[PDB]
Amino acid sequence: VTLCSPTEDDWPGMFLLAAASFTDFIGPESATAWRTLVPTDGAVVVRDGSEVVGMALYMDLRLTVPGEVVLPTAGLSFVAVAPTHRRRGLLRAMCAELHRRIADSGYPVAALHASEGGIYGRFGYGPATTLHELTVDRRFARFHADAPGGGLGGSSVRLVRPTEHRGEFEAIYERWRQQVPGGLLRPQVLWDELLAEAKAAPGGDRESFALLHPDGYALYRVDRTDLKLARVSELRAVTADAHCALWRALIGLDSMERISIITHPQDPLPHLLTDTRLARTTWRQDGLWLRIMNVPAALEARGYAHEVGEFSTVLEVSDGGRFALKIGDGRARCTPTDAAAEIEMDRDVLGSLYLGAHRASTLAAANRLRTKDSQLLRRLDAAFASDVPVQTAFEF
Amino acid sequence: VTLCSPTEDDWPGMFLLAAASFTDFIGPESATAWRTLVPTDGAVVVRDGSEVVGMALYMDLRLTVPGEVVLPTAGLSFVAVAPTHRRRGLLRAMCAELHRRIADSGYPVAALHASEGGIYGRFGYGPATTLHELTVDRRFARFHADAPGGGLGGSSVRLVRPTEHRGEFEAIYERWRQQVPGGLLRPQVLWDELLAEAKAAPGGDRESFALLHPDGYALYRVDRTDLKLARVSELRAVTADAHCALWRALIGLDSMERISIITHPQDPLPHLLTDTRLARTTWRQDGLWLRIMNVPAALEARGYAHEVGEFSTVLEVSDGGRFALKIGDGRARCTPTDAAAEIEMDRDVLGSLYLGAHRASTLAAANRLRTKDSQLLRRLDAAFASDVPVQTAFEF
Amino acid sequence: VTLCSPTEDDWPGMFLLAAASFTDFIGPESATAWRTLVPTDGAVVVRDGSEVVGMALYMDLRLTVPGEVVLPTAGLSFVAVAPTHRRRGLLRAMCAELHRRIADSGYPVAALHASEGGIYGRFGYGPATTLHELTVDRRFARFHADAPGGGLGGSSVRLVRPTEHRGEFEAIYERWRQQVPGGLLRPQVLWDELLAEAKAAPGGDRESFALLHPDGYALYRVDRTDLKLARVSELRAVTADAHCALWRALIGLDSMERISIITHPQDPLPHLLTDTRLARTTWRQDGLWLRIMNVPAALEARGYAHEVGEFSTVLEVSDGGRFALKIGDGRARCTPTDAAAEIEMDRDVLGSLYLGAHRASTLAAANRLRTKDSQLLRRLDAAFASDVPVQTAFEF
Amino acid sequence: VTLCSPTEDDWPGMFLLAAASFTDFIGPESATAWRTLVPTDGAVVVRDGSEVVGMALYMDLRLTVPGEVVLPTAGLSFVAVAPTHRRRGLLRAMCAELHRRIADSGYPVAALHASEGGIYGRFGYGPATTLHELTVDRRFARFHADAPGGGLGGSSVRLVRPTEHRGEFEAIYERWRQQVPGGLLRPQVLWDELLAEAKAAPGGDRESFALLHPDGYALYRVDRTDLKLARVSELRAVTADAHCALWRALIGLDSMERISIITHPQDPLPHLLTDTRLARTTWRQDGLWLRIMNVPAALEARGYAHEVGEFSTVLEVSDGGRFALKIGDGRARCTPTDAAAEIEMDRDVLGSLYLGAHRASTLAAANRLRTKDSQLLRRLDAAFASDVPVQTAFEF
Ligand SMILES: Nc1nc(SCCCN2CCCCC2)nc2sc3c(c12)CCCCC3
Ligand SMILES: Nc1nc(SCCCN2CCCCC2)nc2sc3c(c12)CCCCC3
Ligand SMILES: Nc1nc(SCCCN2CCCCC2)nc2sc3c(c12)CCCCC3
Ligand SMILES: Nc1nc(SCCCN2CCCCC2)nc2sc3c(c12)CCCCC3
Ligand SMILES: [Cl-]
Ligand SMILES: [Cl-]
Ligand SMILES: [Cl-]
Numbered sequence A, B, C, D: 001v002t003l004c005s006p007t008e009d010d011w012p013g014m015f016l017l018a019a020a021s022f023t024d025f026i027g028p029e030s031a032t033a034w035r036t037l038v039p040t041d042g043a044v045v046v047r048d049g050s051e052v053v054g055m056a057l058y059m060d061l062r063l064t065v066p067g068e069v070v071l072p073t074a075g076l077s078f079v080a081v082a083p084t085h086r087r088r089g090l091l092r093a094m095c096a097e098l099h100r101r102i103a104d105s106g107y108p109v110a111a112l113h114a115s116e117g118g119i120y121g122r123f124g125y126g127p128a129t130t131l132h133e134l135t136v137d138r139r140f141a142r143f144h145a146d147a148p149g150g151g152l153g154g155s156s157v158r159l160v161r162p163t164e165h166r167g168e169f170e171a172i173y174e175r176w177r178q179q180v181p182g183g184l185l186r187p188q189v190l191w192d193e194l195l196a197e198a199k200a201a202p203g204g205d206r207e208s209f210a211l212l213h214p215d216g217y218a219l220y221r222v223d224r225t226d227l228k229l230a231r232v233s234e235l236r237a238v239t240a241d242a243h244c245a246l247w248r249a250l251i252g253l254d255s256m257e258r259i260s261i262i263t264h265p266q267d268p269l270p271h272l273l274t275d276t277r278l279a280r281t282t283w284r285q286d287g288l289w290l291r292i293m294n295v296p297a298a299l300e301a302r303g304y305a306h307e308v309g310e311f312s313t314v315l316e317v318s319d320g321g322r323f324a325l326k327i328g329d330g331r332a333r334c335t336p337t338d339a340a341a342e343i344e345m346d347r348d349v350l351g352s353l354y355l356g357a358h359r360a361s362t363l364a365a366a367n368r369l370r371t372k373d374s375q376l377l378r379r380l381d382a383a384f385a386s387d388v389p390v391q392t393a394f395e396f
């Protein structure tokens, strides 16, 4: 049982583990496009001797954080252990090796999407964004008088084929991802992938349509089996006008009973309607998970709330260092100290605070975050809070 | 069609409308206990001529708001129009008369629980609290190492019969309701009611049990039909230790597969577990709705966040007045002005901001709240935000 | 195995067979009220030796037929064979004995409600009325401009308790049953029974409410388990105005999603709505079954369509006689003949034609009704057709 | 927003609206075969400026009406408004333009199949045929002694592949459609379409089989997911013998639990069985909708019942003219008058009466049809009634 970087001979055996480990496996044709995002020495395999019984890799990503700051981010993916090799500490050995390489490479944070919620906490990953499915019964949906874009004359929104308006989607997404915490750069090869999934599959998904505004788009398709449900796969809106305009078009899908979308907890859609209760939360789950690789680099890189007045404290991350933390004028200075800790937390808890999805007060109440000063707790809450609500970009 | 205060002759006819309008009607035996909370001239009936074709009333309540401030609150309830008299503007006439009496009586706010989400917005009520159902698959549930009360020696929690420990529940609730925004005073007659529902009913609900801590309780019963589901009807915890201790006991119900509870979005329970994903949000909805009766009285009565620095603005409520609003040191001064408005909103939107459940930024994005100053929006957000998360007390 | 009229000693043993044979058995308390409708020698029991292993009886009923003519009718009911005695020709022996007594007593027709659709055809019973369940999604339901009772001012309909308005229901029903084919006289003891079922049962049915017009009523209750469904148990309307008025009230039940009713195929309700498709047929089945005991007496008693011109024919009922049938001026003369048959049918087929529910053309196409003259078929169709659509009164 | 006849440049944009508006869209390959049935100037498009935001067309059809009379019929289809352009009166403008062209072209009637039951009533369309789904549990099904084709010797019915017996299906259908009200001429291109859908699709429908008699056929396939259900897509029988013979073969499908078919309310199938209750009505809905374009032309073209004696009246269609109507010897004469109206109805109500599906008495009871003479109502009922029951041909 040896842990190595895979050669080109190892990949056929990795795809077999992938096929047997992930249901959604789209096969080696689209594996070619995701492979370009893996750097040299981005991948580890465990061989028994011989076959592949374990793999993990990371991809080079660009993650937007509060203050419209863009961090180089190691995206962990394709993590699998063979059903023949469970409870052998392969995951722990592979994660330990990639984290070593990620840190040495100079990535301040790593990120992943979790197949289960009970695995990644112990390797220092905290859930950092919340997926929030809204299902609108669009037969009852009436827009509030206050709602934008209810005036006479033409609609700004067009119904289009995705593949004929690639340039415009790219441009709108690029604007979106730079202004929103949780935003990821989407490279050309993932746009090739996205627009390939937009066409109908034999005995599979139905054809995707697009609603296009100057400052937003919505990709959607009718459900395979439930022909009265439209699923919005992706809605990117740069302005409140574009968001409302796009939803007026989606509520216009008069052959549908229900529109569902996976969005964020602060989606304004419910407030656009006369009955806020028509936008039912049907599903909630963790989205992006964050491991803070370099605590000082990460805390200094993001912006903080300007409303909270300047304050200093000593933060201890369990096995992650102890730091004098000074926050004022929406910037942080984070420097080594041996002074007594005022705040203690595990590294995963910091990940969960970092994009403003979770409040320090909430984590404190569960004793995940320890301090003996309630004032300092209120000040952390306010500082780490994100002006622009955190959203989830795309699964990787 | 005449609108009057009901005499004792009108009540038999009101109960018939209640029976035909509300399914959960427990009949006139428990109507005697809710009737004590209705003041003289708290009720209006519409007669056709003759029978009752419309009714509405309010009850005298005490609602806790941010800053542990307790407001006299008109609780609207028992609102019904006969199926024979729809679309006749009876609701609008009854609401207009009660609001007149509520205002003249000197209540700064009114509140209700909504049977539908599309009715009460137009009479100035805004959803102010969020109900959040968590369903825990307790077969997988393991408490995090950080979680309080995992040490050796005795449990602090006892399994008891509710009716034998009334005094202790009352005391714990009284402590809870005074420290939590959304808290309501529960008078003796509603404790009589609650402990009567605690016993098993023939072909109805099963027997309620209680878990009792010094600083918290949980009332729960097994589901009528699903015998592997335990429903927590009510969990009141004054300390984080009590909350964790009570949940360790509930996760100890080893004959159950699932524990469900209707709680608030900031419930720390998910963070007490090694797998946060085991506490699934199964249901979300509006809880308490708030109509601000006197804008200056209400805005001046509540506490604000100490973290935001002193700031002044001019708020206009549509048909509710225009005010110079000055917030600093967690207090507000709200005085008449004819100066140009900086913020505009309908009266319902103010209700939704008032207990900190909804962010001004969110409502602004839906154009329910208008300003041309993003800095002022950030400052409102921060100020109106509640240190202690808003919870829902009991339905009325 | 001996077939006899039961003595008062036999009844305890009949109730046990009833309990074991019919689920809906309400027990001997309400068996006292149905027993009054059984004449002396109206009942047969089969004893093994000793216990009751078979029973059947008939009740004295008054059935309205086309031409507002009221026939004395033997109502077959309480028909059961013990599970220990199947395939022993007990049903055939009991039916043969009661039919003998019914004929000798001078009843022109017998009737029953069938537990299965494959039993009673061979004893000469034909399905004569059609039950037709309409389920209205009342959230979408809007009344057509043409619909009666949409004007300003008071409603004619009142929401009442059934038991407080017995006299008025009785009177309206009595008017209804005399003008509608399928109508049955409802004696005092069955009104006692109906108004006893109107009150709520512990772990059973919910409380029944009534909508009362001068010329119609609707009894309804909310479903045990589905709390958004209202079931209309009984709607009697003497005028089109009363029918529309009552449905405007039922569509006013704003807490309900769906109203269901068991009605007849020609119910005008769908045409009262802007969308006829909102009144979905959810269920269809045979209602009342008819055995013509005396062919000439029955054919001469009912009225026929005045529109068809006078015509003569020879009808043969298989083992029921052969008759010269002359129909003109909406009356029939039916006299013995040995002349060649022009029409042949089994006795059950005549039952199915007799109230106008089924067309001779339809039964002819299935070769249940034989003739070599298509003109005669058209003339039978037209003659037997009922001006007033046939309805089902109550189950017995 | 301009309304025009589409050029060949407009069609790509029409197919995109079709794809986004109709789920069942089979794509432009089969759009080529339906396009041949659209005359020059049979189509209208609405452009925004530019893209297609609205379309509607009509096809040249031949509809059989009572008296085996065949009318030229404008078949409205492919009617869609873009979700971006709702509530802009595009449907009303397109329907107004096509109705103008249809009338000027000299079509006496137009017809459509409705996607919802609440749209087309206001443009003068009445539901004229009833779809009636029967589901037979064929494990219990035993044919009555009276049923044709139960004798010894060979079956007349053969199990065949559809595509190998096109000529014979065509011939039988052609005979069927000329003798049945609701019948449509099926042109060669729709037989090409029907026999292309008869073969199995990858991850789609299973292979269609045919039962072939000299005087009837039944096309059927096993359900995609429910492998114990056979769906009869189409059963055409010219004689009662052929209908019974085909059903004896379908009840012979011994691997199936259930046979379902969409048929008409007067289908004799239930009467072919010993238990009529085995043929359960599972579904009912409106089929073909009829707009009478020229009232006199339409009323004079159809045959009437010979049984009703000669009678005269004055019919007023709301905004459709007023006519002296004289019916006798199964023919109508319909001429202009200013004499006082005896009958009044909207144009949609006439459509609903025209093929005999709905009775004037039923529509009168809902006040859709006004007269102060009950005798005249009985005479209309009898006259408009169809000897041959009305069936639905194929959806367009
Ligand atoms: N990284 C890749 N992603 C995808 S699509 C998103 C899947 C959802 N997840 C399912 C399990 C939990 C995490 C999210 N496809 C592919 S294919 C492929 C990789 C990859 C990883 C890079 C190496 C080349 C092979
Ligand atoms: N006010 C009362 N409450 C209750 S229990 C909570 C019901 C849930 N709601 C269901 C509908 C929406 C609002 C909440 N029971 C009673 S009984 C009664 C009153 C009353 C109102 C006071 C007048 C005496 C009669
Ligand atoms: N005749 C009676 N009816 C009823 S209620 C309707 C039952 C539905 N059926 C269920 C099975 C198929 C027929 C209809 N209850 C009773 S109780 C009783 C009799 C009786 C029959 C008369 C003799 C006294 C005992
Ligand atoms: N007219 C056409 N029909 C069909 S198949 C029946 C569909 C069911 N409906 C679904 C919605 C309600 C009405 C019935 N396919 C096509 S494809 C096509 C047309 C068309 C209309 C003619 C213009 C060429 C394009
Ligand atoms: Cl999102
Ligand atoms: Cl709560
Ligand atoms: Cl009925």
Ligand SMILES: [Cl-]
Pocket (backbone or CB within 6 Å): D262, D263, D264, D391, D392, D393
């Ligand atoms: Cl059909």
Ligand code: NA
Pocket (backbone or CB within 6 Å): A144, A145, A146, A147, A148, A271, A272, A273, B366, B367, B368
């Ligand atoms: Na809005």
Ligand code: NA
Pocket (backbone or CB within 6 Å): A366, A367, A368, B144, B145, B146, B147, B148, B271, B272, B273
């Ligand atoms: Na914890």
Ligand code: NA
Pocket (backbone or CB within 6 Å): C144, C145, C146, C147, C148, C271, C272, C273, D366, D367, D368
């Ligand atoms: Na009407």
Ligand code: NA
Pocket (backbone or CB within 6 Å): C366, C367, C368, D144, D145, D146, D147, D148, D271, D272, D273
């Ligand atoms: Na037959």
